[PDB]
Scaffold this motif. Structure first.
Motif, PDB file in Angstrom:
ATOM      1  N   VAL A   1       0.876  -1.146   0.000  1.00 55.90           N
ATOM      2  CA  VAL A   1       0.000   0.000   0.000  1.00 55.90           C
ATOM      3  C   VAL A   1       0.919   1.201   0.000  1.00 55.90           C
ATOM      4  O   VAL A   1       1.665   1.445   0.964  1.00 55.90           O
ATOM      5  N   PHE A   2       0.841   1.969  -1.073  1.00 61.11           N
ATOM      6  CA  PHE A   2       1.675   3.139  -1.214  1.00 61.11           C
ATOM      7  C   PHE A   2       1.083   4.283  -0.430  1.00 61.11           C
ATOM      8  O   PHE A   2      -0.159   4.425  -0.257  1.00 61.11           O
ATOM      9  N   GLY A   3       1.987   5.112   0.036  1.00 60.91           N
ATOM     10  CA  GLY A   3       1.642   6.464   0.501  1.00 60.91           C
ATOM     11  C   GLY A   3       1.355   7.304  -0.727  1.00 60.91           C
ATOM     12  O   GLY A   3       1.905   7.082  -1.820  1.00 60.91           O
ATOM     13  N   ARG A   4       0.446   8.244  -0.552  1.00 60.91           N
ATOM     14  CA  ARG A   4       0.062   9.216  -1.562  1.00 60.91           C
ATOM     15  C   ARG A   4       1.286   9.875  -2.271  1.00 60.91           C
ATOM     16  O   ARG A   4       1.401   9.821  -3.505  1.00 60.91           O
ATOM     17  N   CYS A   5       2.165  10.509  -1.490  1.00 61.76           N
ATOM     18  CA  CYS A   5       3.320  11.221  -2.039  1.00 61.76           C
ATOM     19  C   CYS A   5       4.401  10.267  -2.537  1.00 61.76           C
ATOM     20  O   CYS A   5       5.120  10.545  -3.518  1.00 61.76           O
ATOM     21  N   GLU A   6       4.515   9.150  -1.853  1.00 62.54           N
ATOM     22  CA  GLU A   6       5.398   8.048  -2.273  1.00 62.54           C
ATOM     23  C   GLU A   6       4.997   7.570  -3.685  1.00 62.54           C
ATOM     24  O   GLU A   6       5.865   7.392  -4.562  1.00 62.54           O
ATOM     25  N   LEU A   7       3.702   7.398  -3.930  1.00 57.65           N
ATOM     26  CA  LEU A   7       3.234   6.954  -5.272  1.00 57.65           C
ATOM     27  C   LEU A   7       3.450   8.049  -6.275  1.00 57.65           C
ATOM     28  O   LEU A   7       3.910   7.784  -7.387  1.00 57.65           O
ATOM     29  N   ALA A   8       3.110   9.286  -5.873  1.00 55.73           N
ATOM     30  CA  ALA A   8       3.310  10.426  -6.731  1.00 55.73           C
ATOM     31  C   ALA A   8       4.777  10.503  -7.246  1.00 55.73           C
ATOM     32  O   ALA A   8       5.041  10.670  -8.457  1.00 55.73           O
ATOM     33  N   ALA A   9       5.714  10.379  -6.320  1.00 61.51           N
ATOM     34  CA  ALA A   9       7.129  10.385  -6.668  1.00 61.51           C
ATOM     35  C   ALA A   9       7.593   9.221  -7.569  1.00 61.51           C
ATOM     36  O   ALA A   9       8.311   9.442  -8.496  1.00 61.51           O
ATOM     37  N   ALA A  10       7.164   8.007  -7.292  1.00 58.62           N
ATOM     38  CA  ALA A  10       7.461   6.866  -8.138  1.00 58.62           C
ATOM     39  C   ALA A  10       6.907   7.058  -9.551  1.00 58.62           C
ATOM     40  O   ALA A  10       7.609   6.804 -10.545  1.00 58.62           O
TER      41      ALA A  10
ATOM     42  N   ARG B   1      -0.685  17.675  -3.358  1.00 57.26           N
ATOM     43  CA  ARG B   1      -0.419  18.833  -2.534  1.00 57.26           C
ATOM     44  C   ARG B   1       0.490  18.455  -1.376  1.00 57.26           C
ATOM     45  O   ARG B   1       0.296  17.439  -0.669  1.00 57.26           O
ATOM     46  N   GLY B   2       1.528  19.244  -1.216  1.00 52.00           N
ATOM     47  CA  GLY B   2       2.486  19.031  -0.139  1.00 52.00           C
ATOM     48  C   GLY B   2       3.528  17.974  -0.337  1.00 52.00           C
ATOM     49  O   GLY B   2       4.463  17.898   0.476  1.00 52.00           O
ATOM     50  N   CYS B   3       3.431  17.167  -1.406  1.00 53.37           N
ATOM     51  CA  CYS B   3       4.465  16.140  -1.655  1.00 53.37           C
ATOM     52  C   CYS B   3       5.810  16.768  -2.151  1.00 53.37           C
ATOM     53  O   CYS B   3       5.797  17.714  -2.954  1.00 53.37           O
ATOM     54  N   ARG B   4       6.926  16.206  -1.694  1.00 51.62           N
ATOM     55  CA  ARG B   4       8.247  16.564  -2.199  1.00 51.62           C
ATOM     56  C   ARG B   4       8.521  15.741  -3.445  1.00 51.62           C
ATOM     57  O   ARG B   4       8.732  14.528  -3.362  1.00 51.62           O
ATOM     58  N   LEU B   5       8.513  16.384  -4.594  1.00 53.85           N
ATOM     59  CA  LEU B   5       8.645  15.689  -5.879  1.00 53.85           C
ATOM     60  C   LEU B   5       9.924  16.134  -6.576  1.00 53.85           C
ATOM     61  O   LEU B   5      10.728  16.856  -5.990  1.00 53.85           O
TER      62      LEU B   5
END
Ligand SMILES: [Cl-]
Ligand SMILES: [Cl-]
Ligand SMILES: [Pd+2]
Ligand SMILES: [Pd+2]
Length: 129
Positions: free
Chosen positions: A2-11, A125-129
């Motif tokens: 199960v991915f984290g929101r920002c973790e998935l966004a970055a991948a 929103r708020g993810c470090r990308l």
């Protein structure tokens, strides 16, 4: 996984999904949220006997081989199990081919009915990308 929101966004960003065929990263994150709740192991059977696999619920009817979908296609040339992996490559690469089809991201009914025309940028929103 199960991915984290920002973790998935970055991948997804690293695999080149941000603005792929003009779909911003938030669209892809939104689609994964409503298809799988970010669960790579998600599966769901369709009425026709086909099955949907993975973070983006890719359908064995056209895109992968699961050994149990008679007369289907395998246009991504993968076993469907490959789409359940903690490594999202197979799902992202396959999704790139799907979104190149005439319908774009409308191929994902959850995208169309929950993400399309909404503020999908809220998803990153708020993810470090
Ligand atoms: Cl093959
Ligand atoms: Cl990898
Ligand atoms: Pd092959
Ligand atoms: Pd990989």
């Amino acid at each position: 996984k199960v991915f984290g929101r920002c973790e998935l966004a970055a991948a997804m960003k690293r695999h080149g999904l941000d603005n792929y065929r003009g779909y911003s990263l938030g669209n892809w994150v939104c689609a994964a949220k409503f298809e799988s709740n970010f669960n790579t192991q998600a599966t769901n059977r369709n009425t026709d006997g086909s099955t949907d696999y993975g973070i983006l619920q890719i359908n064995s009817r056209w895109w992968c081989n699961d050994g149990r979908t008679p007369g289907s296609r395998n246009l991504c040339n993968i076993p469907c199990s490959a789409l359940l992996s903690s490594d999202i490559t197979a799902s992202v690469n396959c999704a790139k081919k799907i979104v190149s089809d005439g319908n774009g991201m409308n191929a994902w009914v959850a995208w169309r009915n929950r993400c399309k025309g909404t503020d999908v940028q809220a998803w990153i929103r708020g993810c470090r990308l």
